[PDB]
Design a protein around this ligand. Structure first.
Ligand SMILES: O=C(Nc1cccc2cccnc12)C1CCNCC1
Lengths: 156, 39
């Protein structure tokens, strides 16, 4: 299957028609998505197969074919771009200055953009197009609207 | 059973549709990986 670097939709045919369950990032031959999209299940690309290599439900991250590759971080200052890939719709950059998830363990980037759950996995970029983490794990706030973490994994 | 399709290059695109605010939220992360507003 296609190994080309860039962003991908995660589709299933288990439901009616073809349904976009999520999104992922191909880099250095490894496919990076969020655990809640695939559930750690294997994926197809053409007639090729991607087998899970790493994953962790709490971080809500999963890599395929190899270890996590994405080590770039929000600088705590600069605006970011969500390369949003919504269901049925073309890739859309949507530029925002991230908020902040304050946790007992530490502060995390947070982007406040609302989109269908099928957009889970779309990357968030810095000014050099480096992926600083994945969109699609956070919280519904006072307003009824959605705020997602900038979820980044650790490289080795 | 689940499959991928390419949806673009990952590139910074100058003059994109800027939007969204920058809230500071107090959150807790549970063992299931589910965030929650700590109040
Ligand atoms: O918040 C989550 N899922 C979403 C991703 C992206 C957009 C959403 C819009 C509304 C509602 N949920 C959304 C996660 C899922 C798995 N961990 C627990 C919360």
């Amino acid at each position: 299957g296609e190994t080309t670097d860039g962003v991908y939709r995660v589709m299933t045919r288990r439901l009616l028609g073809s349904t976009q369950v999520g999104v992922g990032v191909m880099q250095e031959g490894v496919f990076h998505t969020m655990w809640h999209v695939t559930k750690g299940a294997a994926l197809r690309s053409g007639e090729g197969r991607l087998d899970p290599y790493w994953g962790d439900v709490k971080q809500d991250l999963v890599s395929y074919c190899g270890p996590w590759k994405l080590d770039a971080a929000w600088d705590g200052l600069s605006e970011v771009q969500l390369l949003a890939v919504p269901p049925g719709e073309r890739a859309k950059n949507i530029q925002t200055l991230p908020g902040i998830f304050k946790t007992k363990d530490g502060d995390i980037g947070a982007v406040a953009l609302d989109y269908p759950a099928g957009t889970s996995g779309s990357p968030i970029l810095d000014k050099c197009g480096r992926v600083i983490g994945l969109y699609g794990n956070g919280v519904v706030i006072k307003n009824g609207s959605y705020v997602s973490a900038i979820t980044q994994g650790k490289r080795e | 059973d689940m499959y991928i399709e390419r949806a673009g290059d990952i590139t910074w695109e100058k003059d994109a549709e800027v939007t969204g605010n920058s809230p500071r939220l107090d959150v807790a992360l549970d063992e299931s990986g589910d965030f929650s507003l700590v109040e």
